[PDB]
Design a protein around this ligand. Structure first.
Ligand SMILES: *[B@-]1(O)O[C@@H](C#N)c2ccccc21
Ligand SMILES: [Cl-]
Ligand code: NA
Ligand code: NA
Length: 261
């Protein structure tokens, strides 16, 4: 309401297109802004790839220990962990951690490959009840974020509801859900995004995304002090192909929607 006016002003100031969905699990309420529009997920899609592997591991519990070769031919444009393991192997657990905690693009590609490709990550989403998410490309091209292009997009509403299912619901088994949350709480890449708009005492598990057109995203499960958890998706994209990242916009959106909680 007033929060709606504040998000609209933030969007206006920012010069881009802002998408927000907050779920407050205390009362099952939502704050939504462009929450049914599509946005390029960029690296926030790494959550869904890792979750698809975790789901597969429920019925193949040795899956996370399976070794995957890292070759020079696997390197792409952002390989902080994988580059250190070239000519060796990483387990699917290590690749999941690398994708979620360091945003490693080789790791993402290995997760995608294992489950069967981008369309298999999408099928996992569908099987959960998310009929909006679509993963269509591998790294690095899934981050082009061209205006009007539906590839590799979802909506804030759908991603918030799915993140809630994965982290606070029981889409995943007890061990797998705990593992996803632990991985997201150990993210090294999120302190300037949603977390920067929340009090220091609050605990956050998040995954950021960056891409073309200044696309700057974050999805988070939040444990506020002495309150039930929140789910927050903040997606942002800009009109210029070479626009700079705007993590401050995500921090501001997070501050706006959590004011009073
Ligand atoms: B994600 O959008 O893809 C990676 C690249 N390039 C990356 C690095 C750091 C944060 C988010 C992402
Ligand atoms: Cl504080
Ligand atoms: Na989604
Ligand atoms: Na964050």
């Amino acid at each position: 309401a007033d929060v709606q006016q504040k998000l609209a002003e933030l969007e206006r100031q920012s010069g881009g297109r802002l998408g927000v969905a907050l779920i407050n699990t205390a009362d099952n309420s939502q704050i939504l802004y462009r929450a049914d529009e599509r946005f390029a997920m960029c690296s926030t899609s790494k959550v869904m790839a890792a979750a698809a592997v975790l789901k597969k591991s429920e019925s193949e519990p040795n899956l996370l220990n399976q070794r995957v070769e890292i070759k020079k031919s696997d390197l792409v444009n952002y390989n902080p962990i994988a580059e250190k393991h070239v000519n060796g192997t990483m387990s699917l657990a290590e690749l999941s951690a690398a994708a979620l905690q360091y945003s490693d693009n080789v790791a993402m590609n290995k997760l995608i490959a294992h489950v069967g490709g981008p369309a298999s990550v999408t099928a996992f989403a569908r099987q959960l009840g998310d009929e909006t998410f679509r993963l269509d490309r591998t790294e690095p091209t899934l981050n082009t974020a061209i205006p009007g292009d539906p590839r590799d997009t979802t909506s804030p509403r759908a991603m918030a509801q799915t993140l809630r299912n994965l982290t606070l619901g029981k889409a995943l088994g007890d061990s797998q859900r705990a593992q996803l949350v632990t991985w997201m709480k150990g993210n090294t890449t999120g302190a300037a995004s949603i977390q920067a708009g929340l009090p220091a005492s609050w605990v956050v598990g998040d995954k950021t995304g960056s891409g073309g057109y200044g696309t700057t995203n974050d999805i988070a499960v939040i444990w506020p002090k002495d309150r039930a958890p929140l789910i927050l998706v903040t997606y942002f994209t800009q009109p210029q192909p070479k626009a700079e990242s705007r993590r401050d916009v995500l921090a501001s959106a997070a501050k706006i929607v959590t004011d009073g909680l």
